A = this chain, B = another copy of it.
Amino acid sequence: TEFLKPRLVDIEQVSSTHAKVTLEPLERGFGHTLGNALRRILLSSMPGCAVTEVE
Protein backbone atom coordinates (compact mmCIF):
# COMPACT_ATOMS: atom_id res chain seq x y z
CA THR A 1 0.00 0.00 0.00
CA GLU A 2 1.98 2.95 -1.40
CA PHE A 3 -0.64 5.01 -3.30
CA LEU A 4 1.08 8.36 -2.57
CA LYS A 5 -0.53 11.24 -4.48
CA PRO A 6 1.01 14.60 -5.46
CA ARG A 7 0.11 18.11 -4.38
CA LEU A 8 0.14 21.29 -6.47
CA VAL A 9 3.28 23.40 -6.22
CA ASP A 10 4.05 26.89 -7.56
CA ILE A 11 2.08 27.81 -10.67
CA GLU A 12 4.68 29.99 -12.36
CA GLN A 13 2.95 32.54 -14.56
CA VAL A 14 5.65 33.59 -16.99
CA SER A 15 4.34 36.86 -18.37
CA SER A 16 0.64 37.37 -18.98
CA THR A 17 -1.57 34.38 -19.64
CA HIS A 18 0.55 31.24 -19.83
CA ALA A 19 1.72 29.20 -16.89
CA LYS A 20 4.10 26.39 -16.02
CA VAL A 21 2.73 24.01 -13.38
CA THR A 22 5.00 21.33 -12.02
CA LEU A 23 3.77 18.46 -9.88
CA GLU A 24 6.46 16.56 -8.03
CA PRO A 25 5.26 13.38 -6.26
CA LEU A 26 3.94 11.04 -8.99
CA GLU A 27 4.46 7.28 -9.30
CA ARG A 28 6.06 5.49 -12.26
CA GLY A 29 4.24 6.30 -15.47
CA PHE A 30 1.39 8.40 -14.08
CA GLY A 31 3.07 11.50 -15.47
CA HIS A 32 2.33 10.66 -19.09
CA THR A 33 -1.17 9.52 -18.04
CA LEU A 34 -2.14 12.81 -16.43
CA GLY A 35 -0.37 14.76 -19.16
CA ASN A 36 -2.11 12.98 -22.04
CA ALA A 37 -5.49 12.99 -20.28
CA LEU A 38 -5.50 16.65 -19.24
CA ARG A 39 -3.91 17.55 -22.59
CA ARG A 40 -6.52 15.87 -24.76
CA ILE A 41 -9.43 17.12 -22.67
CA LEU A 42 -8.15 20.71 -22.76
CA LEU A 43 -7.17 20.67 -26.41
CA SER A 44 -10.17 18.76 -27.75
CA SER A 45 -13.24 19.16 -25.54
CA MET A 46 -13.72 22.42 -23.64
CA PRO A 47 -16.86 24.48 -23.28
CA GLY A 48 -15.79 27.61 -25.11
CA CYS A 49 -17.36 30.34 -27.21
CA ALA A 50 -15.82 31.30 -30.54
CA VAL A 51 -16.65 33.68 -33.34
CA THR A 52 -20.04 32.60 -34.67
CA GLU A 53 -21.45 35.38 -36.88
CA VAL A 54 -20.03 38.76 -37.89
CA GLU A 55 -22.33 41.09 -39.84
Instruction: List residues of A whose CB falls within 8 A of some B CB.
Output: 27-30, 32-33, 36-37, 40-41, 44-45
Contact = CB atoms under 8 A, between A and B. Distances in A.
B29 A40 contact: yes
Q: Is the interface of A mostly helix, strand, loop or mixed?
A: helix
Count identical subunits in the complex.
2
Contacts of A37: 33, 36-37
A28 B41 CA distance: 10
A41 B45 contact: no
Contacts of A41: 29-30, 33
Contacts of A29: 40-41, 44-45
A16 B29 CA distance: 30
